[PDB]
């Protein structure tokens, strides 16, 4: 398993941005925003919650000051719609998808 730091903020319909740590520790029922392979944004419920125990965490800081704090193998979407480990996006100097909500 690969996973995100407590403080990583997920956008919810009901509550706005909430740390994933709160969502999982309290098993908060909520609705998040997802993107399909054509770039359409839609909303859907959180279906499951998992505490993944203790793992190595890295902080990745973008040119715009934004931060991603996660396990290095956790996958994120690139501009061209691939799902790749954040550490690989860093090492290969790839472009993260950025949706404006």
């Amino acid at each position: 398993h690969h996973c995100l730091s407590y403080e990583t903020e997920i956008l919810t319909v009901e509550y706005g941005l909430l740390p994933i740590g709160k969502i999982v520790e309290k098993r908060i029922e909520c609705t998040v925003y997802s993107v399909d392979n054509n770039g359409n944004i839609y909303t859907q419920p959180v279906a499951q919650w998992h505490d993944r125990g203790e793992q190595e965490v890295f902080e990745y800081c973008l040119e715009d000051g934004s931060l991603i704090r996660a396990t290095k193998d956790h996958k994120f979407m690139t501009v061209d719609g691939q799902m790749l480990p954040i550490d690989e996006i860093f090492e290969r100097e790839l472009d993260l998808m950025r949706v404006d909500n």
């Binding site: 997920i10 969502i23 997802s34 959180v46 965490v57 800081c61 993260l96 949706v99």
Partner: protein
């Protein structure tokens, strides 16, 4: 266009996942799209 500038190790921490159906991804603050 907006690269990851730096990587810093923060040690071992208690970490988390959520799961959704359909495309198995969700939006974060600042517009990133994370996998389940």
């Amino acid at each position: 266009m907006i690269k990851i500038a730096t990587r810093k190790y923060l040690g071992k921490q208690n970490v988390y996942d959520i799961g959704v159906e359909r495309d198995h991804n969700f939006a974060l603050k600042n517009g990133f799209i994370a996998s389940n």
